[PDB]
């Protein structure tokens, strides 16, 4: 277990010490079963952090300023495929203001992507299309 | 309580009244503990509705034409986090035809995500892509 965390038996504690994204440990031990990450400043979780733990039974993620946006799509993507659902009943959002107090496991893709896109809605392929049509105008 | 519905104390009743996706009231009362929507036209539920009622115990959603796609993901997730699962055994997918007659609570998130086809839905513009490359060859 990393220095910011404390590994007691098969349980790991990484909460209540105000961990941010930058100071979050890069990787976790294989054998950990329960991980409590309560009371930090975690805006969103890095992709592939909680999906690489084979023995993870319950993870506590409450009491954090979760920012539900594009970068939070990973963590929610890991929430659907979980047998137990009790310790995720009251996960809340704190930003953006349009989605204040939204329960985390009840989020759709479009809602998370609306704030992800600065405003080019419906851009499934539009992003490079605008640039290249402008570029073709630029040529001739 | 909203005008199209009928409220009685904590309970709210909005069944058998031709209620559509756009005619749903924006926000039901916070205190509500049982909402019924049987025998309506609801294709899916808008996001942010079922999670704004923390006191909900049961909800009746049968006998409705549920389109099982990405937009219905907010409902299905709410269906997973319920202690009692008695009245959710008759939620069938009226559409798409790829998932005709499937019970909703047993639908994994794999099936619903694939319905809002990221590729198959859009490409009436596959010929448009071919046209981009072909007339770029014209320029080239």
């Amino acid at each position: 277990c990393p220095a910011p965390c404390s590994c007691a038996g098969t349980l790991v504690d990484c909460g209540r010490r105000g961990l941010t994204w930058a100071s979050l440990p890069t990787a976790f031990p294989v054998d950990t079963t329960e991980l409590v990450l309560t009371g930090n400043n975690l805006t969103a979780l890095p992709p592939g952090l909680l999906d690489a733990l084979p023995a993870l039974r319950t993870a506590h993620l409450g009491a954090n300023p979760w920012r539900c946006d594009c970068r939070l799509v990973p963590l929610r993507a890991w929430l659907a495929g979980r047998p137990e659902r009790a310790p995720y009943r009251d996960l809340r959002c704190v930003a953006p203001p349009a989605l204040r107090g939204r329960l985390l496991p009840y989020l759709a893709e479009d809602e998370l992507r609306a704030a992800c896109a600065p405003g080019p809605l419906c851009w499934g392929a539009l992003a490079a299309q605008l640039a290249l049509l402008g570029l073709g105008l630029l040529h001739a | 309580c909203p005008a199209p519905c009928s409220c009685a104390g904590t309970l709210v009743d909005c069944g058998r009244r031709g209620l559509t996706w756009a005619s749903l009231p924006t926000a039901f009362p916070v205190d509500t503990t049982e909402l019924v929507l049987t025998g309506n036209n609801l294709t899916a539920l808008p996001p942010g509705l079922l999670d704004a009622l923390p006191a909900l115990r049961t909800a009746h959603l049968g006998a409705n034409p549920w389109r099982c796609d990405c937009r219905l993901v907010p409902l299905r997730a709410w269906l997973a986090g319920r202690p009692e699962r008695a009245p959710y055994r008759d939620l069938r997918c009226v559409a798409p035809p790829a998932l005709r007659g499937r019970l909703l609570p047993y639908l994994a998130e794999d099936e619903l995500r694939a319905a809002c086809a990221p590729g198959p839905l859009c490409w009436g513009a596959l010929a448009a892509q071919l046209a981009l490359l072909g007339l770029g060859l014209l320029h080239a």
Binding site: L126, L132, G136, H139, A140 | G124, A125, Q129, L135, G136
Partner: peptide
Amino acid sequence: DFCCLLPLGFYVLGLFWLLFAS
């Protein structure tokens, strides 16, 4: 279809500007 409709007019428009170039 719909989500490509907004750039449907846009592929053809830059494409026709290229037709002007040719």
